[PDB]
Design a protein around this nucleic acid. Structure first.
Ligand SMILES: O=S(=O)(O)C[C@@H](O)CN1CCOCC1
Ligand SMILES: [Mg+2]
Ligand SMILES: [Mg+2]
Ligand SMILES: [Mg+2]
Ligand SMILES: [Mg+2]
Ligand SMILES: [Mg+2]
Ligand code: NA
Length: 756
DNA sequence: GACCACGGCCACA
DNA sequence: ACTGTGGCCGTGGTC
């Protein structure tokens, strides 16, 4: 199984290294054949000789074009001839390229900014994480001495915890009687022992939580102060750093550094992304927190160091189990995109589709379009219409059913050959014309995007079939991971066509797909009402909820099935509508907000404040309880009863303060904010106090009893003393709980005053 | 100073 | 920064 690729220079020539794991043995394949290149388009093939005589400078050594090759490729589905410019070293082409681009006889250069090892994986048709080879894993965490006002890593590393299949153990340079504690003399011996543990375990993946921005940087700073060689790589190298926009990420050559923070932030949405919070969310069991204050005090007084070690052991044991749950899926994503698990676990979704598309484009001899320049980016600042959300039939409905279009947008793209290369193509014999936008799509030849999406969705159906037949639960889940990810990728390819930074950006294709989908949904609505007698309560973009006014439950189900068959025949191509489920009752507040209950009793809430992270748990809990009473038993009397009980508890200040915390995120440099609301105000004060509030910082504030601007009255919950503070129950009643439960109970006549 | 437009944050598809 | 559609609220601007 391929794990990663990179390249090392040797006598000036590049050498690709393929880190594999075959038959349970770590192997390194060396290739000295691959040559760096990019494509260039000339007004006249004549100037190729003048293009051969181009110069530049790197490391005091002039860089020249090695050779040229005339290659014929298809750009935008159209034939074109292009010169392939070869170079001696990969780093030569980050130079020269701007010089070539500015040459008079060149039009543009293509596939220039492509990583050499990535280009190898693509051009060689190599797929990471392919095989039944199980991987050895090891999760490590650190515990450091923190003193305020000091620089980074001024204090020492107190403990180094690691966890694997055998268990969790902590290495520390002080005496603790905990059985999982190995005691050493100095921080140097602690680090040294950790490297020995890694070296002897030869781990394939190293699981860290936020290790890309802390654990490895702290370990590096200490290994430089104490004069250690942090040779954690299988090639005998130290963890290398690579920039990732504002922040950085660390690689362990010959291994895969799996930082769980970016993966978990992307996959799950929670109010706060603390390790303890992530654990109790994914596994249901709480994890105790020991703050740096307690840690430093315990180390300096030598008292209660056992508890600090327990935190370290857990911090690692949970990191392993979390990684064990999130690695197989991310490995299958790596298999799908054709890039290393390291890169896919840290890259944005819009960048993953670029890797996938560039692989496919190489498979189809399609010259990959470049990225948008600044002027075209502004030219791409255009807006098009999207889905059709109907003003919901607000209130409570009974015996209802949701019908959805399976992969609506992808089905449209394939059915009508929707793609930038099949748009207004002069000289075709078959054209499908897009509603409202009037864009003509050639169907004589299948398009790039439709071909990819077609092959993809074909695989997903195949994958689901093998899954339902597969007997190993592991293998099954692997297949289940692929089918879900295939669906995400397909719909993401549509977003690429609308992404300004995307290389295959066709606004026409986007608005055409939206228009088609609007049409298909509208007709379905008209037919299910006029021809079959239903009332559409709500519809967003790819489906709708509906029922027959005063209908028997089983009647709705049966009559619903009939409309599916009727509409599917009238539905062109693979555009199908399907029966997601039946719900006894459901409340619809407004667009993008509702909740329904299955016949078993499971409630699905969407958009309602119960799912929001920027809302007090007391409001979310209360709104949920109201929703349960109504959607389960209709005890509206109990619902208002619950509201009154909660409001009285808040009046008497008997509600746990943790349920009154509002979690909001800083999305930019506080310097550039233009509306200092409560959360950015709290952080701005924290900023002056010393704390660095950066993009992504989650602020957790509470409102203390007082008056005036909400901002100049909120404190971070880490600064809340129940003995010295009192929360503004009025705010948490007249601005949190009531303004949410009212929106639901307004349908039944109750007003805020009627709720105490 | 009462009312309202509105950054700004998050959610659904 | 997938995109688009959408609902909120604390805050200040505005007569
Ligand atoms: O049945 S509900 O839960 O009311 C609505 C969902 O089925 C809608 N889907 C669309 C596809 O992505 C997941 C959500
Ligand atoms: Mg390029
Ligand atoms: Mg190519
Ligand atoms: Mg047209
Ligand atoms: Mg195409
Ligand atoms: Mg059909
Ligand atoms: Na792209």
């Amino acid at each position: 199984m391929i794990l990663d690729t990179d390249y090392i220079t040797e006598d000036g020539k590049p050498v690709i290294r393929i880190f594999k794991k075959e038959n349970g043995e770590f192997k390194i394949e060396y290739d000295r054949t691959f040559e760096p290149y990019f494509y260039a388009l000339l007004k006249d093939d004549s100037a190729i000789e003048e293009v051969k005589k181009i110069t530049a400078e790197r490391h005091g050594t002039v860089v020249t074009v090695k050779r040229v090759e005339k290659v014929q490729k298809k750009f935008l589905g159209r034939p074109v001839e292009v010169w392939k410019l070869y170079f001696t070293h990969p780093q030569d082409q980050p130079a020269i390229r701007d010089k070539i681009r500015e040459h008079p006889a060149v039009i543009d250069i293509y596939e220039y900014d492509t990583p050499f090892a990535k280009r190898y994986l693509i051009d060689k048709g190599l797929v990471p994480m392919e095989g039944d080879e199980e991987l050895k894993m090891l999760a490590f965490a650190i515990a450091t001495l923190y003193h305020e006002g000091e620089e980074f890593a001024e204090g020492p590393i107190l403990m180094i915890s690691y966890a694997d299949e055998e268990g969790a153990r902590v290495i520390t340079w002080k005496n603790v009687d905990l059985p999982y504690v190995d005691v050493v003399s100095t921080e140097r011996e602690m680090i040294k022992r950790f490297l020995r543990v890694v070296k002897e375990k030869d781990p394939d993946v190293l699981i860290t939580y936020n290790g890309d921005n802390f654990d490895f940087a702290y370990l590096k700073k200490r290994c430089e102060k104490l004069g250690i060689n942090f040779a954690l790589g299988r090639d005998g190298s130290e963890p290398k750093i690579q920039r990732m926009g504002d922040r950085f990420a660390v690689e362990v050559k010959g291994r895969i550094h799996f930082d769980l923070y970016p993966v978990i932030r992307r996959t799950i949405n929670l109010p706060t992304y603390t390790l303890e919070a992530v654990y109790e969310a994914v596994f249901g069991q709480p994890k105790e927190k020991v703050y740096a204050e307690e840690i430093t005090t315990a180390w300096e007084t030598g008292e209660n160091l056992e508890r600090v070690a327990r935190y370290s052991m857990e911090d690692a044991k949970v990191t392993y189990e979390l990684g064990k749950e999130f690695l197989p899926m991310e490995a299958q994503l790596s298999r799908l995109i054709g890039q290393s698990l390291w890169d896919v676990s840290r890259s944005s979704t819009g960048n993953l589709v670029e890797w996938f598309l560039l692989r496919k484009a190489y498979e189809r001899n399609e010259l990959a379009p470049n990225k948008p320049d600044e002027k075209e980016l502004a030219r791409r600042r255009q807006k098009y219409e999207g889905g059709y959300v109907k003003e919901p039939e607000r209130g409570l409905w009974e015996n209802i059913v949701y019908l959805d279009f399976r992969s609506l947008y992808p089905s449209i793209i394939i059915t009508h050959n929707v793609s930038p290369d099949t748009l207004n193509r002069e000289g075709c014999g078959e054209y499908d014309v897009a509603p409202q936008v009037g864009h003509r799509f050639c169907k004589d030849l299948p398009g790039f995007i439709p071909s990819l999406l077609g092959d993809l969705l074909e695989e997903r159906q195949k994958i689901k079939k093998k899954m339902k037949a597969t007997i190993d639960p592991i293998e099954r889940k692997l297949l289940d991971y692929r089918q879900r990810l295939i669906k995400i990728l397909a719909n993401s390819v549509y977003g690429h066509m609308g992404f300004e930074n995307a290389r295959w950006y066709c606004k026409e294709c986007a608005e055409s797909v939206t228009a088609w989908g609007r049409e298909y949904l509208t007709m379905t609505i008209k037919e299910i009402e006029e021809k079959y007698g239903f009332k559409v309560i709500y519809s967003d973009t790819d489906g709708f909820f509906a029922t027959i006014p005063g209908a028997d439950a089983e009647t709705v189900k049966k009559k619903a099935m009939e409309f599916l068959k009727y509409i599917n025949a009238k539905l062109p191509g693979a555009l199908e509508l399907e029966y997601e489920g039946f719900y006894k009752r459901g409340f619809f507040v407004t667009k993008k907000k509702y909740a329904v209950i299955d016949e078993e009793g499971k409630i699905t809430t969407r958009g309602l404040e119960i799912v929001r992270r920027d809302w007090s748990e007391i409001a979310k809990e209360t709104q949920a309880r109201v929703l349960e009473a109504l959607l389960k038993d209709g005890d509206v009397e109990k619902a208002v009863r619950i509201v009154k009980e909660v409001t009285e508890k808040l009046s008497k200040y008997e509600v746990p303060p943790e349920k009154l915390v509002i979690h909001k995120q800083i999305t930019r440099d506080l310097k550039d904010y233009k509306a200092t609301g409560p959360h950015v105000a709290v952080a701005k004060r924290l900023a002056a106090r010393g704390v660095k509030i950066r993009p992504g910082t989650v602020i957790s504030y509470i409102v203390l009893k007082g008056s005036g601007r909400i901002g100049d009255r909120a404190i971070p919950f880490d600064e809340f003393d129940p003995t010295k503070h009192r929360y503004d129950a009025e705010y948490y009643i007249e601005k949190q709980v009531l303004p949410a439960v009212e929106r639901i109970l307004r349908a039944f006549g109750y007003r805020k005053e009627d709720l105490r």
